[PDB]
């Protein structure tokens, strides 16, 4: 037929168009930054098919904007009627693959998966005109249910003469034969489920992160259905991009009747997943794969690491719009790198906290809140809590029951979603003792234990904490000591790796510089790649020199902190020193920790608490 009913799509024309485009397309703007591992002077998609033949992956990913660049009619027809277009694309690709690479072994033929449809619109702006069309989503996963088996081909057996048949599902309904095929008995055919064929299904709930937000809009929850290999490709807390079709389903009046409601439900059928983002750091998914084809970038970063000032440069490049507080930014960078994740299960000690927890104590008239906001917006898997707004049960996990299905026994809280991430706590003073009780175990054991009615479980909460606090009077009164000003139990304070006592010196140079900077307010990719490479390619280790330096630092710290009025020292500070030294070793791209790293860690530890200016026998900071 020339056209399909209700559409303008021609099958043969689109097939030829796609086959030609798979050989013709070339784009000059896509440099080696994203045309990764491919000869740019050659056609791109044919090279992709060749790489598929090399590896044997039965799936190919296609960017929509490339097709739109080639022509607009194909783009519009793919967006409008995906059902009439994608199956043509599958066979168009398969014919080319089998012609160019005959007798290549595959378990099943090639399926094409579009991605990156340009839509920057709020989901509430969707209209019935867009039903059954291809859309994109950027969000975070919060709930994933168990797999559901759904039938595709039924198996029937004759109860009288053991004759067996198979019936393929058509239009979503199975028609079982009412008469046998060898004894002609009526209604002798019985259905056997285990002999049939099934497919996987999963339901996902996602939280929207729209670019455009109207006035007074509450957050949104989106229901997604994932099938086959797309199952288990995302985990709660992950920030992903999704490409899929927009659907509508009627709802029954009640489960025992077949009547349906007039007002329809809605959901989105996922077709494609993406993890890359141009604003936030790389996730752990891509780090666990050998995708560093950019040997140019590898060489550039390895040459940069040998330069002496790169450390400071990183502290300069972490935040352009933030002030002269270089020590804070260095501490945040060392937090980003993190310590080595050693394995101590054979020892029986348990898990050892390899991450960095930092505290910033100061007056409200400072920039600690902006630092927390920047760290939240910069790192993936980030969470932000503020004061009494959260409860003890709000963190960890809580008991629930599904509003759509019968039960969902447990649902994760803020801390678990932050697993392998960063949690920023603000107004730490106002938090009650009930939540601090949870924090006590979270901050050290990296695990949570929950024991309630019919629910006994242990969860992983491997997070890193950035806490902000205020003086009790909202002023740093110099007559009172540091401990009296902070007013926190020593058990909670001891677990913080670094404590930054923000103080106002009222220096004229500071005033001039800050005023000039603030009034004047009227490579990120290189940093991202370097951080990912260092975080995923090197395991720090230390020699005896670092060991003895650490021991000397520990005894010196114990001598200094013995005097009352100042924050006393504990054995956990030794482990904090070890973690900071390992992070500094990671910064230099060194597998060996040198005495320079230990000395730098000691310097940061001394400077953060301002113990040099502080009077050792009165506990009062001086200038």
């Amino acid at each position: 037929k020339l056209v399909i009913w209700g559409t303008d799509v021609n099958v043969a024309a689109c097939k030829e168009n796609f086959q030609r485009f798979l050989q013709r397309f070339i784009d000059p703007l896509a440099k080696e930054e994203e045309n990764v591992g491919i000869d740019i002077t050659e056609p791109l998609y044919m090279q992709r098919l060749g790489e598929i033949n090399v590896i044997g992956e039965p799936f190919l990913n296609v960017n929509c904007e490339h097709i739109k660049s080639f022509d607009k009619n194909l783009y519009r027809q793919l967006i409008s009627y995906p059902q009439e277009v994608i199956p043509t694309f599958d066979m168009a690709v398969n014919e080319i693959f089998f012609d160019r690479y005959p007798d290549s072994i595959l378990e099943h033929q090639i399926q094409v998966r579009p991605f990156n449809a340009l839509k920057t619109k709020n989901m509430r702006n969707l209209n019935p005109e867009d039903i059954d069309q291809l859309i994109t989503i950027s969000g975070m996963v919060i709930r994933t249910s168990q797999l559901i088996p759904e039938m595709q081909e039924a198996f029937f057996q004759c109860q009288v003469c053991a004759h067996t048949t198979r019936v393929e599902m058509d239009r979503g309904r199975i028609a079982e034969p009412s008469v046998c095929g060898r004894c002609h008995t009526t209604h002798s055919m019985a259905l056997i489920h285990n002999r049939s064929l099934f497919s996987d299904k999963q339901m996902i709930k996602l939280q929207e992160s729209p670019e455009d937000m109207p006035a007074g809009q509450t957050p949104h929850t989106v229901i997604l259905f994932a099938h086959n290999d797309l199952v288990d490709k995302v985990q709660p807390g992950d920030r992903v991009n999704v490409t899929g079709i927009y659907r509508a389903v009627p709802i029954r009046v009640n489960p025992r009747v077949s009547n349906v409601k007039s007002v329809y439900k809605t959901h989105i059928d996922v077709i494609h997943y993406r993890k890359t983002d141009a604003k936030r750091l790389h996730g752990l998914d891509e780090e666990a794969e050998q995708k560093l084809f950019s040997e140019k970038r590898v060489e550039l970063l390895k040459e940069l690491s040998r330069k002496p000032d790169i450390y400071e440069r990183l502290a300069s490049a972490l935040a352009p719009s933030i002030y002269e507080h270089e020590d804070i930014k260095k501490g945040i960078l060392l937090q980003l790198f993190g310590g080595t994740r050693k394995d101590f299960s054979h020892t029986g000690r348990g898990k050892f906290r390899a991450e960095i927890n930092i505290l910033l104590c100061g007056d409200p008239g400072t920039s600690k809140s902006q630092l927390l906001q920047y760290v939240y917006n910069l790192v993936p898997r980030g969470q932000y809590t503020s004061g009494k707004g959260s409860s003890a049960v709000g963190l960890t996990a809580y008991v629930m029951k599904d509003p759509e299905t019968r039960q969902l026994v447990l649902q994760t809280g803020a801390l678990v979603l932050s697993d392998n991430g960063i949690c920023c706590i603000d107004e730490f003073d106002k938090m009650n003792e009930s939540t601090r009780s949870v924090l006590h175990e979270v901050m050290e054991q990296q695990t949570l234990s929950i024991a309630k009615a019919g629910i006994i479980c242990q969860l992983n909460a491997r997070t890193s904490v950035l806490a902000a606090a205020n003086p009790i009077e909202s002023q740093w009164n110099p007559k009172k000591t540091t401990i009296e000003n902070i007013q926190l139990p020593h058990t909670l304070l001891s677990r913080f790796d670094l404590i930054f006592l923000m103080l106002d010196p009222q220096d004229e140079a500071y005033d001039r510089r800050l005023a000039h900077h603030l009034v004047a307010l009227y490579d990120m990719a290189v940093l991202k790649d370097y951080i990912a490479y260092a975080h995923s390619t090197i395991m720090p280790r230390l020699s005896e020199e670092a060991s003895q330096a650490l021991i000397e630092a520990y005894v010196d710290m114990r001598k200094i902190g013995s005097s009352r009025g100042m924050v006393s020292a504990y054995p956990r500070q030794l482990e904090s020193l070890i973690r900071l030294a390992e992070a500094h070793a990671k910064v230099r791209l060194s597998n060996k920790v040198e005495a320079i790293d230990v000395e730098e860690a000691k310097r940061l530890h001394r400077e953060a608490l301002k113990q040099s200016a502080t009077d050792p026998r009165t506990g009062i900071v001086d200038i």
Binding site: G6, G216, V263, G389, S391, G394
Partner: protein
């Protein structure tokens, strides 16, 4: 009773007739232009005024008022019949639904001979091919009614109501006509829907399936179906119309395609609607017979200078309030007896988006948000997004509320993590607070105004004279313009030049030096400089100047000095 054909012809001639009104000062064929736009997809809904019809025939208007639904259907059919006449060209660009409509009309022309007999079931449903909606505007002579007094006498009539919005439903598609395809034929079956629930069909009524007696079975399709935009609204009475000792009553409204996304929770709205019942089947009741539930179907929803001239004095505070309204957090502490609450009330009334809280009555769930049968509904802080919020008796609030308010002021977002709720809410609102006689207010807020009642004889006598004048003549001694002026002002965004920085820098340094000289001073920090810059930008916006000037900086400095003193 009158025949519908005559009135349909009258409707057609009324649509074809009027030439009168034009905005640019001429005589323009308005309904002809509307119909021409309706011919293609350049307009997808049409609103008809019942004041314009009143010129030639009032009995039509009365019959429309008492029997609104039938007349709506008649108007729709008349306009659909008129559409082919005014059509002049084919669609330049069309979407999926138009593709179905064109294809169906083309094959109808292909197959159906003019002489063959066609069964009444063989025709297309009227609303399936139609793609335009008709709505009515309430008569100006008709007086808006009260929610309490609409009763069984008003079922089926056309009414106009005014109320306050409290609940809004998210947009979801609603079925209009369902499309079925047979298992063994190329025919298409259409099922209209006029019930809250319906039962999908099974067998095919197509002629070929009947002749062959094949027993083909129908399947639903979503592409061929027609869907409309549907919303549900909850309204309440104004506090003015409630009788003595009673409680405001509520009503439910349903909203259609283009009227969707007009109203937001907390808004005051005027609704032109039809009052219709719903037949209820469910739990058994005491009294036999046919009972029903009432609901309203909407067709149209409609939503320096002197600040509080009644209050004497506080001129500088009024200037600061003006700047806060215009924009780039203000706290007032005062002795009892000085009208601080009335200023907050005036601010709430003046602002387009505003909320006013009195204390523990709105504490807790009244702020932040909560989950209700599931949908998340916000509190006062959420409603006042991109507006101005007003809080009275700030010191008496619970600590949790104060922490939430501090978070809103500094971070501008709320975070909730409790059993069942895990969200971040956007609150881009500026806060005005009132209190009675702390470092938290000085450190967090931008401007503090301390109102001390010094018993000066002249000031007290003038205040007494002003109050006597107000109480006697009911007017101060000798808002729409103010709202329009603020709206025009906020459109622009001035910028800070490079040179003035030095001057500003110098001032800041000197100010801090003075603050360091006066050991009794309490707070100076970069936040004060930011507040000064924001005030200067607001003043420059008031002058509509592209570049910040010196007078704005001087006035901001003077205002901060006056507040601190």
């Amino acid at each position: 009773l009158k025949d519908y054909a005559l009135e349909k012809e009258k409707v057609k001639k009324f649509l074809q007739e009027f030439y009168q009104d034009d905005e640019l000062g001429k005589k323009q064929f308005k309904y002809g232009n509307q119909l021409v736009r309706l011919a293609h997809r350049e307009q997808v809904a049409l609103y008809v005024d019942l004041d314009d019809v009143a010129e030639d025939d009032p009995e039509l208007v009365d019959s429309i008022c008492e029997n609104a639904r039938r007349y709506a259907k008649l108007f729709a059919d008349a306009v659909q019949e008129l559409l082919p006449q005014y059509k002049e060209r084919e669609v330049v660009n069309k979407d999926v639904l138009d593709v179905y409509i064109e294809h169906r009309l083309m094959m109808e022309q292909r197959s159906r001979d003019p002489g063959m007999v066609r069964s009444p079931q063989n025709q297309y449903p009227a609303e399936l091919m139609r793609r335009f909606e008709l709505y009515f505007q309430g008569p100006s002579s008709n007086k808006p009614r009260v929610i309490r007094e609409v009763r069984a006498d008003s079922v089926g009539k056309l009414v106009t109501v005014r109320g306050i919005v409290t609940r809004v439903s998210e947009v979801k598609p609603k079925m209009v006509v369902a499309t079925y395809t047979c298992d063994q034929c190329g025919a298409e079956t259409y099922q209209p829907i006029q019930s809250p629930t319906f039962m999908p069909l099974i067998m095919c009524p197509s002629q070929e399936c009947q002749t062959n007696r094949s027993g083909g079975r129908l399947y639903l399709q979503t592409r061929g179906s027609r869907f409309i935009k549907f919303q549900e609204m909850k309204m309440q009475e104004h506090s003015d119309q409630v009788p003595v000792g009673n409680i405001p009553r509520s009503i439910t409204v349903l909203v259609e395609g283009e009227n969707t996304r007009i109203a937001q929770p907390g808004d005051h709205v005027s609704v032109t609607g039809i009052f219709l019942p719903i037949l209820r089947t469910g739990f058994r009741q005491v009294v036999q017979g046919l009972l029903s539930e009432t609901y309203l179907e909407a067709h149209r929803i409609v939503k320096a200078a002197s600040i509080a001239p009644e209050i004497y004095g506080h001129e500088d505070v009024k200037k600061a309030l003006l700047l806060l309204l215009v924009g780039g957090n203000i706290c007032l502490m005062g002795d009892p007896g000085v009208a601080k609450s009335q200023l907050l009330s005036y601010i709430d009334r003046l602002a387009p988006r505003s909320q006013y809280t009195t204390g523990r009555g709105s504490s807790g769930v009244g702020l932040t948000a909560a989950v209700l049968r599931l949908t998340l509904e916000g509190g006062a802080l959420v409603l006042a997004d991109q507006g101005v919020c007003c809080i009275d008796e700030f010191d008496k609030m619970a600590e949790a509320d104060r922490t939430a308010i501090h978070e809103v002021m500094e971070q501008q977002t709320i975070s909730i993590a409790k059993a069942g709720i895990l969200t971040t809410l956007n609150a881009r609102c500026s806060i005005l607070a009132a209190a009675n006689p702390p470092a938290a207010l000085l450190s967090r807020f931008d401007l503090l105004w301390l109102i001390q009642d010094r018993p000066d004889r002249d000031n007290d006598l003038r205040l007494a004279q002003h109050i006597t004048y107000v109480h006697q003549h009911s007017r101060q001694p000798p808002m729409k313009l103010m709202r329009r002026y603020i709206a025009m002002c906020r459109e622009k965004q001035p910028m800070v030049p490079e040179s003035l920085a030095d001057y500003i820098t110098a001032a800041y340094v000197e100010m801090r030096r003075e603050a360091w000289a006066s050991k009794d001073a309490t707070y100076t920090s970069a936040r004060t400089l930011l507040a000064i810059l924001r005030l200067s930008t607001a003043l420059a916006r008031l002058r509509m100047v592209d570049v910040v000037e010196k007078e704005d900086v001087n006035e901001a400095i003077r205002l901060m000095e006056m507040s601190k003193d």
